[PDB]
Amino acid sequence: EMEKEFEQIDKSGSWAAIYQDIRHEASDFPSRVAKLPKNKNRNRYRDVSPFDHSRIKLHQEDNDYINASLIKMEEAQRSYILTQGPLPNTVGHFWEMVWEQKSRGVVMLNRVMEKGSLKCAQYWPQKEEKEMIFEDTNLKLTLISEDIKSYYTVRQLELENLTTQETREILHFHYTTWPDFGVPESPASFLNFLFKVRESGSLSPEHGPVVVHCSAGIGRSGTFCLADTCLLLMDKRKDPSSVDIKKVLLEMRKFRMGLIQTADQLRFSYLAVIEGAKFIM
Numbered sequence: 001e002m003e004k005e006f007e008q009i010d011k012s013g014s015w016a017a018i019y020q021d022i023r024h025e026a027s028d029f030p031s032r033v034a035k036l037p038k039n040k041n042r043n044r045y046r047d048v049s050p051f052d053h054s055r056i057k058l059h060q061e062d063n064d065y066i067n068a069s070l071i072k073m074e075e076a077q078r079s080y081i082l083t084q085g086p087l088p089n090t091v092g093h094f095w096e097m098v099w100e101q102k103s104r105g106v107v108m109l110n111r112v113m114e115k116g117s118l119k120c121a122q123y124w125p126q127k128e129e130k131e132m133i134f135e136d137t138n139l140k141l142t143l144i145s146e147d148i149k150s151y152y153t154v155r156q157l158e159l160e161n162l163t164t165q166e167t168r169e170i171l172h173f174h175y176t177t178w179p180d181f182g183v184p185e186s187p188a189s190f191l192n193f194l195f196k197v198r199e200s201g202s203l204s205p206e207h208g209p210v211v212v213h214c215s216a217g218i219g220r221s222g223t224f225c226l227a228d229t230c231l232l233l234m235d236k237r238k239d240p241s242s243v244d245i246k247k248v249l250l251e252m253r254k255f256r257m258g259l260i261q262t263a264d265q266l267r268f269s270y271l272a273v274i275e276g277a278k279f280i281m
């Protein structure tokens with residue numbers, strides 16, 4: 001059981017060592033499309049690339065490339081798109097992906113500015129009366145409502161396909177309190193946030209996969225999916241203690257490289273799952 005494994009690693013301070021074994025066991029697949037010279041300005045970080053086999057393709061004939069990966073967790077019935085924070089030139093591609101994949105929710109785990117640098121383009125409208133038009137992808141986005149709480153903001157957005165005049169409602173879940181350095185002290189507000197996303201229906205199989213991002217789409221984004229999948233597997237299995245976080249993480253790393261960036265994010269993932277299990281047993 002992971003509570004006991006947690007105490008072992010913690011008491012022994014072996015987190016950097018566990019983390020290194022995961023790094024060494026992790027899959028490595030080609031990412032040829034990401035490294036094409038015509039795609040250089042579609043990537044925020046040169047060392048963070050989607051694998052060719054799991055990459056999301058845009059339905060535009062010119063250039064189908066976006067830095068985004070489909071994570072498919074077959075047993076858990078869960079699929080996630082993990083992507084980078086959009087760039088000024090890819091905001092239109094981002095919303096095209098949301099449209100094409102029939103996603104109901106966008107989960108954002110960063111602030112637009114952190115450590116005095118921009119981590120993400122402002123890709124949603126700040127006021128009801130000032131909608132955004134993405135000329136390159138023929139989409140219109142309107143802020144319908146905004147509910148600001150202490151730890152997160154939920155926004156209702158209307159996305160309109162200007163080509164066909166279909167409209168969809170998108171929910172934007174914005175976790176606003178992840179600190180500039182390190183991880184939250186307690187996982188309570190992160191779990192609250194994860195249960196709010198679940199309650200919305202955004203993670204349900206009726207819809208396309210949820211879009212999850214931070215800056216690179218691997219660190220905080222990774223913690224989100226790992227905690228959700230682990231808690232789901234503990235509800236589904238005859239023996240909840242047969243859930244090995246390390247085996248789940250390695251499975252997700254077949255779909256996108258570098259999920260969980262630091263030994264601290266790994267420790268935080270254990271703590272989130274351990275604490276979330278109490279609200280689930």
Ligand SMILES: N#Cc1ccc(CNC(=O)N2CCOCC2)cc1
Nearest residue numbers: 073074075076077242244247248251
């Ligand atoms: N969705 C999902 C998902 C399921 C399994 C894994 C890793 N394998 C695993 O946990 N086991 C349990 C013990 O017997 C079989 C292998 C990762 C993700």
